[PDB]
RNA sequence: AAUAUGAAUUAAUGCGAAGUUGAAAUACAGUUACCGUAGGGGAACCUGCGGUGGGCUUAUAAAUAUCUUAAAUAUUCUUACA
């Protein structure tokens, strides 16, 4: 059985919610309701087979290349993504409940803004949290997840997926929406994808790919309908950016000691 | 008539030494042995008929074998997680 992780000063967040993002009541329904909704789902689809004793992470890579099993794999991604999200944008990873802290000052580590500067020919902080929020506006028409990555080559980008599309297998990315049109270029990057599969010798048909996820960002109606409401996702989206635990966002970035 | 004794006369058998004529039995003993019975032969034995195993249970291949996430996941784990 996949149950609900605890979250570290829990009773302050089903009082006061998320502090400058949620509400209680938002964050009520973009964890509380809806981790438990996944991980019930999760249990449901897995019980029985040997997917069960798994953690997500783990289901996804697992099922990524299974073409039937994709409802499994949209389950167990979802669930890593949201405590992904949920747990950046937390006011503290530790447990202040009995030591009542109420100074949690976290800014971007020096590699962090060292890597973006490479990655983004100079760019600063905040621009690119403006491209963040540019391209999740322009490139998620519906559900989906933003996310900052860092590939095998050091360099951070920026990357949007479609509903549950995890970063770490690109096959898998769902990053092109292909309800509406395409342009040459989008259908050159599929079909070198494509390629790319297909030159495995596995015969799972799986490719490696070494990319990390830094930030997450849910773009659910599930986490910012009841505080913002239908339009004004470009508003939450610029609160999150804005108000993430660096510990965290820090602690994801490899440094090699 | 019985019992006992001796008895002309006559039958069977044991042991002892010790050669002779064969080689019947014990191994598939060189023809499986033996049981009952019959006939035959210097001698053991041979032959016929049925029976027995205390002789053959001593018994030992015409072969062909299969698909799900090989791993960032199993393989590690020291009373921890829950
Ligand atoms: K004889
Ligand atoms: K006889
Ligand atoms: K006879
Ligand atoms: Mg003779
Ligand atoms: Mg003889
Ligand atoms: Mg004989
Ligand atoms: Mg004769
Ligand atoms: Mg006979
Ligand atoms: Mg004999
Ligand atoms: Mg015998």
């Given at each position: 059985i996949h149950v609900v992780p605890k979250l570290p000063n829990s009773k302050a967040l089903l009082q006061?919610?998320?502090?400058?993002?949620?509400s209680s009541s938002g964050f009520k329904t973009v964890w509380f309701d809806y981790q438990r909704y996944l991980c019930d789902k999760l249990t449901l689809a897995?019980?029985?087979?040997?997917?069960?004793?798994?953690?997500p992470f783990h289901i996804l890579l697992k099922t990524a290349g299974n073409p039937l099993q994709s409802n499994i794999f949209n389950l167990a991604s979802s669930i890593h993504n949201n405590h992904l999200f949920v747990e950046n944008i937390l006011?503290?990873?530790?447990?202040h409940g009995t030591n009542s802290n109420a100074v949690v000052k976290t800014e971007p580590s020096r590699l962090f803004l060292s890597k973006i500067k490479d990655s983004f020919n100079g760019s600063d902080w905040e621009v690119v949290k403006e491209e963040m929020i540019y391209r999740a506006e322009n490139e998620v028409l519906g559900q989906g997840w933003l996310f900052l990555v860092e590939n095998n080559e050091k360099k951070l980008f920026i990357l949007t997926s479609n509903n549950?599309?995890?970063?770490?297998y690109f096959p898998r990315?769902?990053?092109?929406?292909?309800?509406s049109a395409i342009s040459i270029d989008e259908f050159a990057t599929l079909k070198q994808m494509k390629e790319l599969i297909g030159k495995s010798t596995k015969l799972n048909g799986k490719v490696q790919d070494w990319t990390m996820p830094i930030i997450c960002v849910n773009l659910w109606d599930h986490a910012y309908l009841h505080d913002?409401?239908?339009?004004?996702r470009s508003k939450y989206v610029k609160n999150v950016l804005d108000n993430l635990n660096w510990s965290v966002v820090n602690n994801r970035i490899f440094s090699g000691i």
């Open positions: 006061n919610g998320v502090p400058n993002i949620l897995t019980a029985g087979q040997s997917l069960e004793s798994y953690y006011p503290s990873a530790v447990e549950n599309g995890t970063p770490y990315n769902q990053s092109f929406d292909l309800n913002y409401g239908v339009g004004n």
